[PDB]
Design an enzyme around this catalytic site. Structure first.
Site, PDB file in Angstrom:
ATOM      1  N   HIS A  66       0.677  -1.095  -0.129  1.00  0.00           N
ATOM      2  CA  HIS A  66      -0.190   0.429   0.298  1.00  0.00           C
ATOM      3  C   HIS A  66       0.831   1.492  -0.049  1.00  0.00           C
ATOM      4  O   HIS A  66       0.608   2.150   0.857  1.00  0.00           O
ATOM      5  CB  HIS A  66      -1.013   0.133   1.350  1.00  0.00           C
ATOM      6  N   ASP A  92      -2.033  -5.402  -3.632  1.00  0.00           N
ATOM      7  CA  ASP A  92      -2.331  -4.704  -3.457  1.00  0.00           C
ATOM      8  C   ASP A  92      -0.867  -3.314  -2.715  1.00  0.00           C
ATOM      9  O   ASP A  92      -0.267  -2.996  -1.648  1.00  0.00           O
ATOM     10  CB  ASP A  92      -3.143  -4.565  -1.601  1.00  0.00           C
ATOM     11  N   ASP A  95      -3.081   2.685  -2.817  1.00  0.00           N
ATOM     12  CA  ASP A  95      -3.818   2.898  -2.403  1.00  0.00           C
ATOM     13  C   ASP A  95      -3.240   3.166  -0.095  1.00  0.00           C
ATOM     14  O   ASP A  95      -2.753   2.862   0.085  1.00  0.00           O
ATOM     15  CB  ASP A  95      -5.031   2.104  -2.457  1.00  0.00           C
ATOM     16  N   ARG A  96      -4.019   3.989   0.215  1.00  0.00           N
ATOM     17  CA  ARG A  96      -3.713   4.199   2.133  1.00  0.00           C
ATOM     18  C   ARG A  96      -2.760   5.034   1.773  1.00  0.00           C
ATOM     19  O   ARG A  96      -2.103   6.231   2.761  1.00  0.00           O
ATOM     20  CB  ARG A  96      -3.309   3.420   2.578  1.00  0.00           C
ATOM     21  N   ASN A 124      -5.937  -6.330  -4.469  1.00  0.00           N
ATOM     22  CA  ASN A 124      -7.964  -5.864  -5.070  1.00  0.00           C
ATOM     23  C   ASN A 124      -7.771  -4.493  -5.002  1.00  0.00           C
ATOM     24  O   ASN A 124      -8.439  -3.709  -5.614  1.00  0.00           O
ATOM     25  CB  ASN A 124      -8.641  -6.227  -3.683  1.00  0.00           C
ATOM     26  N   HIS A 125      -6.654  -3.899  -4.692  1.00  0.00           N
ATOM     27  CA  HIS A 125      -6.634  -2.326  -5.362  1.00  0.00           C
ATOM     28  C   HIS A 125      -5.687  -1.942  -6.696  1.00  0.00           C
ATOM     29  O   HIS A 125      -5.349  -0.703  -6.816  1.00  0.00           O
ATOM     30  CB  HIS A 125      -5.827  -1.682  -3.852  1.00  0.00           C
ATOM     31  N   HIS A 173      -4.038 -13.075  -3.556  1.00  0.00           N
ATOM     32  CA  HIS A 173      -4.139 -11.900  -2.985  1.00  0.00           C
ATOM     33  C   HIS A 173      -5.410 -11.980  -1.667  1.00  0.00           C
ATOM     34  O   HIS A 173      -5.039 -12.110  -0.533  1.00  0.00           O
ATOM     35  CB  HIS A 173      -4.567 -10.036  -3.198  1.00  0.00           C
ATOM     36  N   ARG A 221     -16.941  -7.141   4.638  1.00  0.00           N
ATOM     37  CA  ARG A 221     -16.347  -6.073   3.533  1.00  0.00           C
ATOM     38  C   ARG A 221     -17.500  -5.775   2.630  1.00  0.00           C
ATOM     39  O   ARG A 221     -17.556  -4.938   2.079  1.00  0.00           O
ATOM     40  CB  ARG A 221     -15.255  -6.664   2.786  1.00  0.00           C
ATOM     41  N   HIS A 248      -3.912  -9.624   2.037  1.00  0.00           N
ATOM     42  CA  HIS A 248      -5.323  -8.916   2.511  1.00  0.00           C
ATOM     43  C   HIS A 248      -5.969  -7.911   3.585  1.00  0.00           C
ATOM     44  O   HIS A 248      -6.799  -6.564   3.497  1.00  0.00           O
ATOM     45  CB  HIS A 248      -6.506  -9.945   1.457  1.00  0.00           C
TER      46      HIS A 248
HETATM   47 MN   LIG Z   1      -6.443  -6.464   0.136  1.00  0.00          MN
HETATM   48 MN   LIG Z   2      -4.689  -4.266   1.170  1.00  0.00          MN
END
Ligand SMILES: [Mn+2]
Ligand SMILES: [Mn+2]
Lengths: 309, 291
Positions: A66, A92, A95-96, A124-125, A173, A221, A248
């Site tokens: 991330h 991933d 993001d973040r 998933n990102h 992931h 989620r 994940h």
């Molecule tokens: Mn994830």
């Molecule tokens: Mn994540």
């Protein structure tokens, strides 16, 4: 050695490792055409390799990052910078965090330089659908433009979905899917492609393990599901696998066992979002499949000195 | 069809899974191929966690250091205490567990139980020979960390029962550092045994703990004020981080390179994460009008 293409990874990889030692958040400047090049070159390598990678130990598998560049650099400083060791990231990358750009570029760059010793799976990102909402969009538009963003999108859309090491360790992931019965379903997956709110590919990128669950359960989620240890066993017992490696989910010590060491979760983003105070993980798999864990304590978590003796 | 989507698609999905290989015999079916294995430490340190007292036995019987510990130095016992997992704590001790093993922060299992209030455990440990006078990084003993009456009592009446000199313990470290500092300065030969883990030096311990005397005495032995530990910290990075004001003044009066950088790229002002921050800048404004 001499000749070849337009993108000079050597020049980029270098410039990217230059902030090693500089204060975190220090930017590695570059041309959007070099970024766009990275995307297109890697995108072309992904499409040239299976969607279900068949890899071979020894290698070091990693979880989420991330955009925490400063830490990713630390991961390589521990397991050794490529091509020193074989790498397999579980997704991933954006993001973040603060530096998704620096982080992904380096990853892709290395993917180009050592395309047979370096691997990236899709987290998933890696869907425009969500990294649009979690900062990567803004970090792109902030330093470039929405189009550069769309180029990354076209790239992420080509990432592999899973990997199987020495025919005994299934990696992805997220996790499992009530649709995944034969690997072949993965192999017959169109690419480029996006990620649906439901489906086999969506499950692989989203699902989670849950001890409190038996069989298949819903997921907090709001998407995909959760699986019990019994589903893990059915899966392994089916394809005759030993382990299911994935990320994940944030786990205190970088790694975390499940279903009696049948499944493991790796998270490689130390002190994720500054919210949690978790360590980063990294699993070493030698030619024997002797799995060990190299941990990365949150940085700036200095332990007060003691004389020693 | 817009929401039924996620909900119904998933449903009319679980469905197919029914006839699917949900029937594939769900055990272990230990194939003749358990080719994947995990490091002993990882496997041992965890077997205790869940509580499979049973497997720990075999793991030990096969040959596993009972006193193995994760990155933070926590042993299979430390964690046991932290989880008020009475049964395990005893299992560990009855099987050879080092009852006084410190963590990477000077915390022995007694500190843990104390700090957490798991009195029944504190009682067991203390009876099995736990060391009530053990001091940690912050100079605290289980008693100092006991923030529950019942706990404080037991520890208080335990230190007084055994006649343990508390301050003696808090002062022990600094005390020694003085002796050594004197010996080095005097003779003229520094014999500093860099600490095996952090790669830090006595100059660092002095600064982090704010031992003004030992420090001053250390500099006078001409010890590099700008030495960095394996993490790349300066004896200033510490005195500042843990906020030892006067420790910083000393470091400055001797031209300590304030512009030093962390191996991760931080200044003494940077990782000086704690309060004081502005004070340094003042001393810095002085490390110029006199040089
Ligand atoms: Mn994830
Ligand atoms: Mn994540």
């Amino acid at each position: 050695h001499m000749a070849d293409g337009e993108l000079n990874v050597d020049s980029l990889i270098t410039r990217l490792l230059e902030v090693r030692g500089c204060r975190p958040g220090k930017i590695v400047q570059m041309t959007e055409a070099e970024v766009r090049g990275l995307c297109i070159k890697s995108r072309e390598i992904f499409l040239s390799q299976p969607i279900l990678l068949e890899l071979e130990a020894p290698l070091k598998i990693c979880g989420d990052i991330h955009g925490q560049y400063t830490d990713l650099l630390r991961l390589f400083e521990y397991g050794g910078f490529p091509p020193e060791a074989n790498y397999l990231f579980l997704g991933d990358y954006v993001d973040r965090g603060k530096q998704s750009l620096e982080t992904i570029c380096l990853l892709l760059a290395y993917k180009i330089k050592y395309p047979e010793n370096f691997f990236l799976l899709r987290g998933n990102h890696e869907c425009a659908s969500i990294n649009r909402i979690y900062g990567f969009y803004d970090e792109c538009k902030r330093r470039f433009n929405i189009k550069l963003w769309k180029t990354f999108t076209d790239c992420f859309n080509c990432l592999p979905i899973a990997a199987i090491v020495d025919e005994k360790i299934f990696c992805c992931h997220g996790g499992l899917s009530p649709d995944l019965q034969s690997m072949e379903q993965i192999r017959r997956i169109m690419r480029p492609t996006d990620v649906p709110d439901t489906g086999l590919l969506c499950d692989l990128l989203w699902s989670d393990p849950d001890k409190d669950v038996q069989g298949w359960g819903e997921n907090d989620r709001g998407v995909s599901f959760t699986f019990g240890a019994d589903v893990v066993s059915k899966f392994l017992n089916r394809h005759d696998l030993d382990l299911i490696c994935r990320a994940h989910q944030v786990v205190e010590d970088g790694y975390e066992f499940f279903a009696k060491r049948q499944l493991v979760t790796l998270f490689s983003a130390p002190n994720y979002c500054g919210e949690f105070d978790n360590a980063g993980g990294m699993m070493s798999v030698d030619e024997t499949l002797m799995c060990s864990f190299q941990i990365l304590k949150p940085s700036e978590k200095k332990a007060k000195y003691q004389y020693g003796g | 069809m817009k929401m039924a989507d996620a909900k119904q698609k998933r449903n009319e999905q679980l469905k197919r899974w029914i006839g699917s290989e949900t029937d594939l015999e769900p055990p272990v079916v230990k194939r003749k191929k358990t080719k994947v294995k995990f490091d002993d430490g990882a496997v041992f340190l965890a077997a205790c966690s869940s509580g499979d007292t049973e497997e720990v036995l075999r793991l030990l019987e096969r040959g596993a250091d009972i006193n193995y510990a994760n990155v933070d130095g926590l042993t299979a016992l430390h964690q046991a205490c932290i989880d008020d997992n009475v049964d395990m704590v005893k299992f560990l001790v009855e099987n050879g567990a080092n009852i006084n093993q410190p963590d990477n922060e000077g915390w022995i299992p007694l500190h843990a139980a104390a700090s957490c209030g798991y009195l029944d455990i504190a009682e067991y440990l203390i009876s099995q020979g736990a060391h009530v006078g053990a001091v940690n990084s912050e100079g605290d003993t289980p008693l100092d960390i006991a923030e529950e009456e019942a706990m404080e009592e037991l520890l208080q009446n335990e230190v007084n029962r055994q006649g343990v000199d508390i301050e003696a313990a808090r002062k022990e470290e600094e005390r020694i550092m003085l002796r050594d500092a004197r010996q080095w300065l005097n003779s003229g030969h520094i014999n500093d045994v860099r600490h095996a883990k952090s790669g830090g030096t006595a100059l660092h311990v002095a600064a982090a703990k704010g031992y003004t005397e030992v420090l001053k005495l250390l500099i006078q032995a001409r010890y590099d004020v700008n030495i960095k530990d394996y993490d790349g910290w300066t004896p200033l990075h510490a005195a500042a981080h843990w906020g030892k004001e006067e420790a910083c003044r000393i470091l400055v009066e001797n031209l300590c390179d304030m512009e030093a950088v962390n191996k991760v790229g931080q200044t003494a002002f940077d990782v000086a994460d704690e309060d004081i921050l502005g004070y340094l800048e003042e001393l810095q404004k002085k490390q110029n009008l006199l040089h």
